[PDB]
Write a protein that binds this DNA or RNA. Sequence first.
RNA 1: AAGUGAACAGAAUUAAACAGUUACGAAA
Lengths: 108, 108, 251, 212, 212, 212
Amino acid sequence: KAERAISLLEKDNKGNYLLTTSQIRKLLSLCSSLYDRSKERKFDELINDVSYLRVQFVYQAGREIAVKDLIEKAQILEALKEIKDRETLQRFCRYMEALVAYFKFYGG
Amino acid sequence: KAERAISLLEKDNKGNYLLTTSQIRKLLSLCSSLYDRSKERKFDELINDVSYLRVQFVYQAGREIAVKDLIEKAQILEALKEIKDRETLQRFCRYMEALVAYFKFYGG
Amino acid sequence: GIKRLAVVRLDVDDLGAAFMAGFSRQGNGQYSTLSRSATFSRSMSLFFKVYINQFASDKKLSIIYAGGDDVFAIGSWQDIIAFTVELRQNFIKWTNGKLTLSAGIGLFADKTPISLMAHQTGELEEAAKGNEKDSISLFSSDYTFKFDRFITNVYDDKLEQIRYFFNHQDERGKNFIYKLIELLRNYESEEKMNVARLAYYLTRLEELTDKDERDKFKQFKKLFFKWYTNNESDRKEAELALLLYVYEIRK
Amino acid sequence: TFAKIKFSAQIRLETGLHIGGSDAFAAIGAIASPVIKDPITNIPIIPGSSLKGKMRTLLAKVYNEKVAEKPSDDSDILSRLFGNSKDKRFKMGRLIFRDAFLSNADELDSLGVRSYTEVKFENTIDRITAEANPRQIERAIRNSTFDFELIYEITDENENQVEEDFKVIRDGLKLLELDYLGGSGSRGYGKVAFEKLKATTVFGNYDVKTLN
Amino acid sequence: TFAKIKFSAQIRLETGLHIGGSDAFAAIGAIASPVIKDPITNIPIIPGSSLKGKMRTLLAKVYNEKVAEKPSDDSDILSRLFGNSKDKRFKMGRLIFRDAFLSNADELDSLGVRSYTEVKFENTIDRITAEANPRQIERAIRNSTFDFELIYEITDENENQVEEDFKVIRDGLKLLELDYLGGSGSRGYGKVAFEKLKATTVFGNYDVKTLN
Amino acid sequence: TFAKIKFSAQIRLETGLHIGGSDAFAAIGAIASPVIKDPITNIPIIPGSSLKGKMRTLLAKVYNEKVAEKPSDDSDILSRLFGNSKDKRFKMGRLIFRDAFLSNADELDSLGVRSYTEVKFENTIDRITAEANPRQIERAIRNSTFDFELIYEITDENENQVEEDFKVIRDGLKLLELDYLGGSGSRGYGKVAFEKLKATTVFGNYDVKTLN
RNA sequence: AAGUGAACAGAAUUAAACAGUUACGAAA
């Protein structure tokens, strides 16, 4: 969950990451706005935001080279199919926060 | 909705797609400008844009070979007749984004 | 500082036991002379009563019940914490490191009845006997270290090398330390999540501050990461060191 | 004798404002100054502490003459409405607000809403160089109602300012609409609008004279 | 004593300008320079932060005697109009703007328009080759009104400098019409025009003297 | 000190030109590059972005001392007139353009016209064969004017060379008359003609020197 | 009466992406 996030994210390629935290404010805006809203109502009611969350990880993957190299390694599209319950979705929301904390520790 | 759009769009013919996301900004400019406007007022009020939206999928289908091969496979003209309600129109607007995000996932 | 006070009850150990047969080391001498035990209790009785008033200079205190067993100190906590561990350093050199010492610093509120204020500060010494014989407690019954370990780790580098590093980031950034003492609270829940969350709120204190001095946060960032991820029992030292710095500069 | 007059109103936000709250304790995206919300759900609740202080500040400048140097010490005709920490004759105040919640969620989701709060991008110029420090803030939505109830009570004994206290509350709520509410609202972010200002009797001990 | 003067006007856009919205936060159409709009509806609204910073910039270069090195520190005759963060005498200003909304929708739909905002295509020349980097921007419509309300109030004590402050506000609004507003106005996109400049009293405490 | 000089002129088109508008974005007629027009009416307006990239290009090849290779980096006598993205001394430009509208509609219908845009038949020959790819274009009207306004201002310090800047603007506008403006004007489509080149003072802070 | 299918490249980039004046106020 959070133990493998320190080794898989560090093992990359060339140093000096050109990607910061401002250019990734688009795909990281729906992940934080989903964990705090799925606990109020049921999971079968919100059927428009679930299908739209997968689109953000596809349209933004073919524009910048600093996006495709991270999704294929962290397996983001693989966990989008296993989830189906409200309790399972709560676990995926916590895994996204691990890829951001360890990213700013080695650089920015 | 989004599961069957990743396999039908990939199954095409010859590789190296010569059509980019900039030459199809005519038929895609009205669908994005209709979803944000239909959520405010009613559906029976806007009657001049519904009939004009279907014309874009017919006039632009005989001027380029990279358009007819996509409409007949994705079945775009079939969904234009089933819609009749404001809630049903919101579902067709989300399906159009699958033909744009997944199109640039394998190339551009 | 605020309107608080500390109550410490110093009580030397290794006194009631090993007092009559503690001089045996050679089969030649008997080591049972009554004069040998008379000068043993008289030499230590001079330090816990007469020498206490000598070391009370340049400080506002009030000794209560002076004796060679258990004493009672009260006053402003701005120096009792530093004077309690300082008095023990003079007893180790006097005995060449052979007799341990214990105490119990306890903080309470202002204008409190002595019937319960002086009674709750004595339970910290009894609760510290779970390890062995050299331990002490701070606020609650959780900070039960090894007494002498408080000066060799917490007061050593965790307290001296922080008085001038974060002091420049005070006032304008005093609220940035509140999130550090609270993050170490929920520890028995999940261990994997407690480590990844700490790496996010710590890196934000390097870019927001002044980047003109590189040696301002580099020495604090390296020590904070090693003092937290090294041992399970070592995390209590960094948690207590950061808590005492908040009460230092306050009001 | 002793009644509990309630002034139920609907605070309609004609312009999205900003209120500072807890930071670096919510989620991982605690940037752009995140506005404090509900500790259980995600509905952006408005605090009641920002309303008691803003209404008293704008009212203690036209109904008095002496310049207010310290709080709880200005004239006497308005000290009994909010409270006084230095006076002994009275301590509890008659004006009690309430942490209103966005009750417009019954029909807000039907009109297609992405999120309850959006991030606004701004910047600044040092008037000697180019653009520097591209900051960012976070605002709320527009045209949202709130369940605001004014809990008012009389002291039974000193019951002779009822006809005078009504014109003060009505003038204070109308003057509050012509001023921003929250933080960093000098650019035009606050400006509330009290919609449907009605009064009712829940305890049932006093009649109803006026309505607005 | 304490009045609430409102300078109601209609901002008529003689030329379509551009305002940089919240990029990488909207829907799938986050490219082509997304313009900020209404968080609930689709009517484009103009922010108030671009008006308070632009009016103070053009005012701090003709009514002063010292080059402004840092914000909130330039002269003194205009620091009390917008505010001051380094002064100890006065803090709150006397000019409050408002996020004006496009109120021209009463007759815009009768003419039959396609959308509220169009996409304009532009590019650049590297002075060594032909067309390079085909970029694109987004603009608004032309000849559109906006309900602009200026919340003006005095602090009672500042009563002997009322007529002196009226000539400063009128000079700032007239000079703003001869300059681009918003963003990317160097090519000729801004240049606003205040139409129907009048004044009225809402609280009712000061007489009506000025108008145009 | 701070003046607002306006150079009012009439851009008379001696020959109908063509400007490539927003491709694949029109209404009922989007054939052969639809020319950009007005988002409200139908009168084709000329964009102000073409007047800034063409006038600066023709001027940066006669008043310079080094071959330019990228924008915002050519000599120094003309960098303060349009802008500079590298120099920290100045960032804002002193020249402000405006989307000139066609004011000739008050008497154009009296001469008996059909429409504002027509389709011109223009193709190409592949030399080795006969007619190949019968393309076409879309031009505007001929002998039309445009109400163009040039907003000029000084920054107080830029006063000891006011007369030096007048000879640069006058030489740049006269040189543009002998060159095509817009797009694909190599076949004799552009060639503008500035009519009634006069100056006036709107703010009123500097005397009137030039006139013709 | 007379083959008429605007052809071919780049699909928004390089600065800067929290700066500061600062914290339990008067009772037990």
